[PDB]
């Protein structure tokens, strides 16, 4: 789900 991508980005930053 494209709408979950930024969540992954947030967690790894």
């Amino acid at each position, epitope marked *: *789900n*494209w*709408f*979950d*991508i*930024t*969540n992954w*980005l*947030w*967690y790894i930053k």
Partner: antibody
Amino acid sequence: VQLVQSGAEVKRPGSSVTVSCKASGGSFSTYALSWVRQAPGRGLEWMGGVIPLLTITNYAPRFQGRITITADRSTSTAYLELNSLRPEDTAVYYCAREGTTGDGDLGKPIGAFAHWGQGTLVTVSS
Amino acid sequence: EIVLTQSPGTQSLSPGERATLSCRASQSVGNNKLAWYQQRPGQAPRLLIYGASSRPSGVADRFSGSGSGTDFTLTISRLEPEDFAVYYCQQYGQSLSTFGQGTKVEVKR
């Protein structure tokens, strides 16, 4: 977070329109920006979006082939291009960015659209 | 494509009354990624609920969201004058996000 869109435009049938959305506040590159339109007296329709940092676009199938969404990190500006315009494309176009959890604007992203531009009326007409 | 059905499309209610608005999805909504927005004439939409039941800090606590799978509800505990408006549901549990057609809450008289 403030999203400010370019002004109303009248466009001929068959032409292409570009609408801009300049963001200030929060973080531009790692939050998802979408475009949503609303034809007069009608409902909201999600068209597509972009995540600037990765350059990852996501288009509704209905607009896949007619739309290009781009993001310029150096100005925090996103762009909607819609081609082959027809009268049924007459609408208010809104950019919308996802929200973040908690106070402030560097929190965990929520997907749903907390921040909306003022809208840009595009009128397709001869 | 997930079709979101908001029925009835209009509700005539009185100030002070409770309102419950239905959003039914044609297929299960992934991770309950279901949002509700309000829109007044001449204005951009505004987010009320995300993730089916989470409410952003600024949004009045008379709005609540519930449900899961295909059966979602926005509840307005007590209608204030400013709550008479249009309400849209939206799913974003897959890359193709979709909106319902909206329910107008209007003043019965």
